[PDB]
């Protein structure tokens, strides 16, 4: 039960699977290191996650007065939000259903001394 801070992000325009593909890297990585990994990641879902993680770290600093280097990305999870439907058309008079997905993203950073 170490002191934590929370951060969320909702109605984001990246499918949750393509979020998890990145988040697997940084479950347990320190904040600074994860931010850098995500700066230099070749994925188009790294920037939202970057913003969320720095958000949580900032909230920990300001609102709960915590050292930024005692921190880790303890718990992370991305989940499926709403879904919008688009009747995209296709041959022989047929019409198929695109589903434009979204995702919520959740981060909880502890403050761990060694």
């Amino acid at each position: 039960e170490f002191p934590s801070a929370t951060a969320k992000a909702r109605y984001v325009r990246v499918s949750a699977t393509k979020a998890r593909r990145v988040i697997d890297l940084v479950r347990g990585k320190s904040v600074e290191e994860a931010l850098d990994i995500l700066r230099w990641a070749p994925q188009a879902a790294s920037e939202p996650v970057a913003k969320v993680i720095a958000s949580a770290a900032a909230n920990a600093q300001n609102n709960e007065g915590l050292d930024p280097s005692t921190l880790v990305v303890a718990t992370v999870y991305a989940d499926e939000g709403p879904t919008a439907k688009r009747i995209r058309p296709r041959a022989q008079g047929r019409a198929f259903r695109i589903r434009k997905r979204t995702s919520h993203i959740t981060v909880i950073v502890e403050s761990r001394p060694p």
């Binding site: 890297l25 850098d36 990994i37 230099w40 990641a41």
Partner: protein, 54 residues
Amino acid sequence: AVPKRRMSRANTRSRRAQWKAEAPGLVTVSVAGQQRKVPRRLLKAARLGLVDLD
């Protein structure tokens, strides 16, 4: 062709776990008195002042 059955949870998640990602191997750089972490591919270009460091 077309599948014939609803391919299970085990097999599904198992193969799905191959679609993963690796992280680039990072290395320090002494960028003008301070330090930042950057791949090794771009080390010289950083030391010469081209890499957009944010």
